[PDB]
RNA sequence: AAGUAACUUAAGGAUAAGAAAUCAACAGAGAUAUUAUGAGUAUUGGUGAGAGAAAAUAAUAAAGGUCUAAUAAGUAUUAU
RNA sequence: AAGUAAUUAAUAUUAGUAAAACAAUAAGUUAUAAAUAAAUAGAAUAAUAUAUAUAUAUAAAAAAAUAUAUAUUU
RNA sequence: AUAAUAAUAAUAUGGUAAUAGAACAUUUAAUGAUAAUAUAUAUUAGUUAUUAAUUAAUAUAUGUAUUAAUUAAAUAGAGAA
């Protein structure tokens, strides 16, 4: 005979749903688990209705603000990169840098990279890779570990569109026959960050034109 | 590259019912990314830790016995082999030890 | 060559049909009655002396220009000098940074 | 000294015989991988696939009228007190015999459940493996592959009957007769059959139509787990089987 | 679909598998009291387990 | 195996063919499965009632 | 609750909308409609009850652009 | 003649896959790091906390709190 | 190192509100032998620790169980309005 008339679920998968209002010996008899006679017995009071006392969403003062200007980077630890390298998944030709796009391709970072990647230092001891990295930013300790390894980090600015283009340049080419140009940092805070040598920002490390233009304006 | 290879290149030992894989022998296949299928699992609301071992081909009982022999420090009781899906559950977070034991062959 | 031309996107092809490249259209605003009147610029009507809105509204013009850039057919389109829009690499290069960027 | 003594490498290829259609004649072996055609028969996975498919299939046309749907007036039939009878509102109440249903469903009732794609693929493989084990998986081909024994003169390598549409002498036609002869030969007249084609074999389905109640001709893309398992003997094209294997292979 | 209680979201913020909140009784009438004693009320506070379930129900996407 | 099938009149399943590595094994299989059913038609395997005795 | 029920009026096989005085952010897109994600996010509330976008990416979709206007004044804008 | 359905959220059990999962058109959701109102900050300088990370504070420690580290990442 | 059944020793087995676990009847969908010597329904008397089903007799229908079993589900069980 066909298997189709002899298939069961795996043991522990299914259950019988508790069926109310269906006789006394059932257990869930006349009252059907409701108790006896109150508002909850025949009607609806809200779960978090605290009775009339000042509730736990009212006693306490409202705290903080939502920074809409915030753009949370996805964190990538050096440890994970090292592990990838050990596994022989970190496929890089000599000279080619491990950029955010490259990380995504490899599966170092996974899921949607909306705003960027920060490189943190959770396995800085056993990190020994002389490859060059490039991300939104890195932790100071992580940077130091990279330097020790014989590597080279560069914090690179990416607007959300610019980041997207970096991650998936072929899509833009398919759609429009042209990948979009990478934007300059318009914001003051961003400019300041990438102008820091301590952060290994690209504007100082590559000696950018924007920074020079700003200096000229300041002079004049 | 080809899903079904040609009749010439396939050896006799590669076929089913050859080399006696069913009788008292086993295999433990690695994951897609290429790691040992041994996992911590935090059941009953983080209260019950257990170590699960997946992707076992062939005789699971024999494999379990071999692992017990390798790791005498874990008790005999705490080795629940669920037969429907063929995976062997251990009580503690004994993942790393299991991996160490398996690596040399699988 | 003809087949390659035909293979061009629709909007661009339509533009070429109705404003062909044999006519050297003006860089500056002109009379609306003129033959060389640029469809991207606002041309003045000679009787009423009112600036007519561009024959190709600004979005459409921009799309046409981007299509031309894609297929390398820019110079056959009439000039977009006195329309304030720049595009892509030329825009990037020629622009001055904002006062806020240079002088916070 | 020896850590895992009984460790070993599993077998990876099962031979399926490639046949000519009208008469199921062995032309070649073809080694299909063990994962497709000889997986361990996990019933639970198979069950999951079947139930999900059944749920997807659901029409869900149950449409009993609730007290709103039901078409009485909203008027109070008897005044609250001073009637000498029980309290009543409008005539639509579930309590009364002509009134609408309590907790009434309303079509279209969506019964669609979800399954992970990998689980579904595994189930598909598993069903196929079970069929192979039973001896109910007839792979027909020989066009692409290199043969051992040559194809017969009156058979053909694809899954189809010749000159089915031709019908000159009598109302009876040849493809139907051939099919009947085939059924008679392999002792599967009343048995359920499942012809998994690659491309649309119009002549085959015409031949089948007499035995439409038991014979189900399906494409490579539209074939189901249910269809495979219900079948008493599946007749799959080699190319179609390859395609299915490719579809439901575990990715690496 | 379900939605967050906005007042509760304003009052409470996530901290791993709990919620943190501000202290009550430090907005006026602070003069006269001891400053050291008052310093107890300046910081934050983790949710009491009694109302944890309520908080979860209020904030389904936290 | 094809020759054996042709002479026999019966079909040896694909899985069986894959499994059995010798002519002797094939013969043994035949003796086990097909032969008794051929001898006695009431003893034969029925599809609708697979767990028959 | 809700611009809902209702009443009233007027049209067509559909109507409505529609080729940016639109979005966006120094990079760019490049019409309107419907759905999915974005997102119960920003936003807002006797800051209670509760209400809640857009950009962007996907589908569905059709050839989707095209002049018919001598380029628009009691109009934009302002106060209320 | 009475605990039903839809859209959601949180738990549990099993099953699939697993440092990834779902989805494969891209995009997204969850996980992979803990914090903080928020900010350009973020886990052993030579090992278990006596080290480190964050918030308060600070020259830097200490101090409260939570988190991170003892062939193989969870 | 399991499951079923059976022994021995021990402890436990009243229960409203409530919580948890396990079954059965009914109806539909998927798979599905069989047959008037059969099946279904009813009555009566037996049987099985028994809301259930089964045996026999009797009656009426039907050339026949969407039947046993496993799953999926429910307008799934009424002395209480
Ligand atoms: Mg009770
Ligand atoms: Mg009371
Ligand atoms: Mg009562
Ligand atoms: Mg009560
Ligand atoms: Mg279901
Ligand atoms: Mg005190
Ligand atoms: Mg309103
Ligand atoms: Mg219209
Ligand atoms: Mg509204
Ligand atoms: Mg105008
Ligand atoms: Mg105007
Ligand atoms: Mg006004
Ligand atoms: Mg400070
Ligand atoms: Mg009791
Ligand atoms: Mg009922
Ligand atoms: Mg009754
Ligand atoms: Mg009763």
Swiss-Prot record, chain A:
GO cellular component: mitochondrial inner membrane; mitochondrial large ribosomal subunit; mitochondrion
Residue ranges crossing the lipid bilayer per the database entry: none
Disordered as annotated region, ranges: 12-42
Main location: mitochondrion
Compartment annotation: Mitochondrion
Miscellaneous comment: Present with 5350 molecules/cell in log phase SD medium.
Primary role: Component of the mitochondrial ribosome (mitoribosome), a dedicated translation machinery responsible for the synthesis of mitochondrial genome-encoded proteins, including at least some of the essential transmembrane subunits of the mitochondrial respiratory chain. The mitoribosomes are attached to the mitochondrial inner membrane and translation products are cotranslationally integrated into the membrane.
Assembly, per entry: Component of the mitochondrial large ribosomal subunit (mt-LSU). Mature yeast 74S mitochondrial ribosomes consist of a small (37S) and a large (54S) subunit. The 37S small subunit contains a 15S ribosomal RNA (15S mt-rRNA) and 34 different proteins. The 54S large subunit contains a 21S rRNA (21S mt-rRNA) and 46 different proteins.
Family assignment from sequence similarity: Belongs to the universal ribosomal protein uL15 family.
Annotated protein name in UniProt: Large ribosomal subunit protein uL15m
From Swiss-Prot, chain D:
SUPFAM superfamilies named in the record: Ribosomal protein L4
Note: Present with 1200 molecules/cell in log phase SD medium.
Any one GO MF annotation of this record: structural constituent of ribosome
Organism: Saccharomyces cerevisiae (strain ATCC 204508 / S288c)
Annotated compartments: Mitochondrion
Pfam families, alphabetized: Ribosomal_L4
GO biological process, one term: mitochondrial translation
Alphabetized UniProt keyword annotations: Mitochondrion, Ribonucleoprotein, Ribosomal protein, Transit peptide
Signal peptide: none
Role according to the record: Component of the mitochondrial ribosome (mitoribosome), a dedicated translation machinery responsible for the synthesis of mitochondrial genome-encoded proteins, including at least some of the essential transmembrane subunits of the mitochondrial respiratory chain. The mitoribosomes are attached to the mitochondrial inner membrane and translation products are cotranslationally integrated into the membrane.
The protein's name in its UniProt record: Large ribosomal subunit protein uL4m
Subunit structure: Component of the mitochondrial large ribosomal subunit (mt-LSU). Mature yeast 74S mitochondrial ribosomes consist of a small (37S) and a large (54S) subunit. The 37S small subunit contains a 15S ribosomal RNA (15S mt-rRNA) and 34 different proteins. The 54S large subunit contains a 21S rRNA (21S mt-rRNA) and 46 different proteins.
UniProtKB/Swiss-Prot annotation, chain E:
GO molecular function: structural constituent of ribosome
Keywords: Mitochondrion, Ribonucleoprotein, Ribosomal protein, Transit peptide
A GO BP entry: mitochondrial translation
Family assignment from sequence similarity: Belongs to the bacterial ribosomal protein bL35 family.
Native source organism of the sequence: Saccharomyces cerevisiae (strain ATCC 204508 / S288c)
Signal sequence bounds: none
Biological role: Component of the mitochondrial ribosome (mitoribosome), a dedicated translation machinery responsible for the synthesis of mitochondrial genome-encoded proteins, including at least some of the essential transmembrane subunits of the mitochondrial respiratory chain. The mitoribosomes are attached to the mitochondrial inner membrane and translation products are cotranslationally integrated into the membrane.
UniProt GO cellular component terms: large ribosomal subunit; mitochondrial inner membrane; mitochondrial large ribosomal subunit; mitochondrion
Compartment list: Mitochondrion
Self-association and partners: Component of the mitochondrial large ribosomal subunit (mt-LSU). Mature yeast 74S mitochondrial ribosomes consist of a small (37S) and a large (54S) subunit. The 37S small subunit contains a 15S ribosomal RNA (15S mt-rRNA) and 34 different proteins. The 54S large subunit contains a 21S rRNA (21S mt-rRNA) and 46 different proteins.
Protein name as it appears in the record: Large ribosomal subunit protein bL35m
Main location group: mitochondrion
From Swiss-Prot, chain F:
Repressor is among the record's keywords: no
Other remarks in the entry: Present with 1350 molecules/cell in log phase SD medium.
Function: Component of the mitochondrial ribosome (mitoribosome), a dedicated translation machinery responsible for the synthesis of mitochondrial genome-encoded proteins, including at least some of the essential transmembrane subunits of the mitochondrial respiratory chain. The mitoribosomes are attached to the mitochondrial inner membrane and translation products are cotranslationally integrated into the membrane.
Protein name: Large ribosomal subunit protein mL50
GO biological process, alphabetically ordered: mitochondrial translation
Swiss-Prot/TrEMBL keywords: Mitochondrion, Ribonucleoprotein, Ribosomal protein, Transit peptide
UniProt record similarity statement: Belongs to the mitochondrion-specific ribosomal protein mL50 family.
An MF annotation (GO) of this entry: structural constituent of ribosome
Entry's Gene Ontology cellular component terms: mitochondrial inner membrane; mitochondrial large ribosomal subunit; mitochondrion
Protein's UniProt keywords contain Repressor: no
Gene: MRPL13
Organism of origin: Saccharomyces cerevisiae (strain ATCC 204508 / S288c)
Assembly: Component of the mitochondrial large ribosomal subunit (mt-LSU). Mature yeast 74S mitochondrial ribosomes consist of a small (37S) and a large (54S) subunit. The 37S small subunit contains a 15S ribosomal RNA (15S mt-rRNA) and 34 different proteins. The 54S large subunit contains a 21S rRNA (21S mt-rRNA) and 46 different proteins.
Location of the protein in the cell: Mitochondrion
């Amino acid at each position: 005979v066909s298997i189709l008339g002899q298939l069961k679920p795996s043991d522990g998968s299914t259950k019988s749903f508790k069926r109310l209002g269906r006789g006394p010996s059932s257990g869930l008899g006349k009252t059907s688990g409701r108790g006896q006679k109150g508002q909850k017995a025949r009607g609806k009071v809200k779960s978090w209705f605290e009775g009339g006392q000042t509730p736990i969403y009212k006693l306490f003062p409202k705290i903080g603000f939502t920074n809409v200007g915030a753009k949370p980077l996805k964190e990538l630890n050096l440890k994970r990169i090292q592990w990838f390298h050990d596994k022989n998944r970190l496929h890089l030709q000599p000279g080619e840098v491990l950029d955010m796009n490259k990380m995504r391709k490899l599966g170092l970072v996974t899921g949607p990279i909306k705003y960027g990647v920060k490189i943190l230092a959770s396995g800085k001891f056993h990190y020994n890779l002389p490859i060059a990295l490039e991300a939104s930013r890195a932790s100071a300790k992580a940077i130091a570990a990279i330097e020790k390894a014989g590597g080279k980090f560069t914090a690179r600015y990416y607007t959300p569109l610019g980041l997207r283009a970096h991650l998936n340049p072929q899509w833009f080419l398919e759609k429009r026959g042209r990948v979009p140009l990478q934007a300059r940092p318009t914001k003051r805070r961003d400019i300041d960050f990438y102008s820091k040598e301590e952060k290994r920002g690209y504007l100082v490390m590559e000696k950018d034109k924007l920074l020079q233009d700003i200096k000229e304006a300041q002079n004049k | 590259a080809p899903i079904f290879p040609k009749l010439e290149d396939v050896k006799m030992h590669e076929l089913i019912g050859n080399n006696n894989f069913g009788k008292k022998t086993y295999y433990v296949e690695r994951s897609r990314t290429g790691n040992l299928p041994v996992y911590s699992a935090y059941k009953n609301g983080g209260n019950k830790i257990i170590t699960e071992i997946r992707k076992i081909e062939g005789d699971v009982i024999q494999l379990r016995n071999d692992l017990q022999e390798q790791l005498p420090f874990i008790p005999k009781k705490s080795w629940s082999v669920v037969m429907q899906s063929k995976k062997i559950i251990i009580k503690g977070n004994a993942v790393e030890a299991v991996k160490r034991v398996l690596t040399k062959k699988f | 060559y003809k087949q390659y031309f035909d293979s061009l996107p629709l909007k661009l092809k339509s533009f070429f049909q109705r404003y062909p490249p044999s006519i050297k259209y003006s860089p500056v605003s002109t009379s609306t009655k003129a033959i060389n009147a640029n469809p991207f610029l606002p041309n003045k009507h000679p009787v009423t002396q009112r600036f007519h809105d561009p024959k190709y509204s600004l979005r459409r013009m921009s799309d046409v220009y981007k299509l031309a850039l894609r297929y390398g057919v820019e110079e056959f389109l009439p000039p977009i000098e006195n329309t304030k829009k720049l595009f892509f690499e030329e825009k990037y290069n020629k622009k001055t940074l904002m006062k806020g960027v240079l002088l916070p | 000294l020896n850590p895992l003594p009984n460790a070993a490498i599993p077998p990876k290829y099962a031979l399926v015989t490639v046949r000519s259609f009208p008469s199921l004649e062995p032309l070649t072996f073809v080694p299909v991988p063990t994962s497709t055609v000889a997986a361990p028969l996990r019933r639970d996975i198979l069950w999951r696939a079947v139930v999900y498919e059944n749920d997807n299939r659901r029409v869900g046309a149950s449409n009993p009228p609730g007290r709103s749907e039901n078409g009485f007036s909203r008027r109070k039939l008897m005044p609250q007190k001073g009637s000498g009878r029980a309290r009543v509102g409008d005539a639509n109440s579930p309590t009364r015999h002509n009134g609408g249903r309590a907790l009434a469903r309303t079509a279209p009732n969506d019964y669609t459940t979800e399954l992970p794609s990998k689980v579904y693929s595994m189930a598909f493989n598993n069903a196929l493996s079970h069929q192979y084990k039973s001896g109910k998986l007839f792979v027909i081909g020989g066009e692409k592959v290199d043969l051992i024994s040559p194809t017969p003169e009156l058979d053909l390598n694809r899954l189809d009957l010749v000159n089915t549409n031709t019908v000159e002498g009598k109302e009876i036609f040849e493809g139907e007769v051939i099919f009947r002869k085939f059924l008679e030969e392999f002792q599967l007249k009343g048995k359920r059959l499942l012809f998994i084609t690659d491309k649309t074999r119009e002549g085959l389905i015409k031949s089948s139509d007499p035995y439409k109640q038991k014979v189900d001709v399906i494409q490579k893309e539209l074939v189901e787990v249910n269809d495979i398992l219900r079948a008493q003997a599946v007749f799959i094209e080699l190319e179609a089987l390859e395609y299915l294997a490719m579809a439901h292979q575990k990715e690496i | 679909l379900m939605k967050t209680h906005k007042g509760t979201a304003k009052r409470w913020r996530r901290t791993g598998n709990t919620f943190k909140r501000g202290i009550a009784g430090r907005k006026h009438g602070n003069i006269g009291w001891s400053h050291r004693s008052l310093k107890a009320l300046t910081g934050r506070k983790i949710a009491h387990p009694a109302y944890s379930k309520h908080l979860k129900r209020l904030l389904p996407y936290h | 195996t094809k020759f054996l099938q042709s002479k026999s009149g019966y079909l040896i399943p694909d899985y069986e063919l894959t499994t059995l590595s010798t002519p002797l094994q094939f013969k043994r299989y035949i003796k086990e499965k097909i032969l008794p059913s051929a001898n006695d038609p009431k003893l034969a395997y029925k599809e609708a009632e697979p767990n028959a005795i």
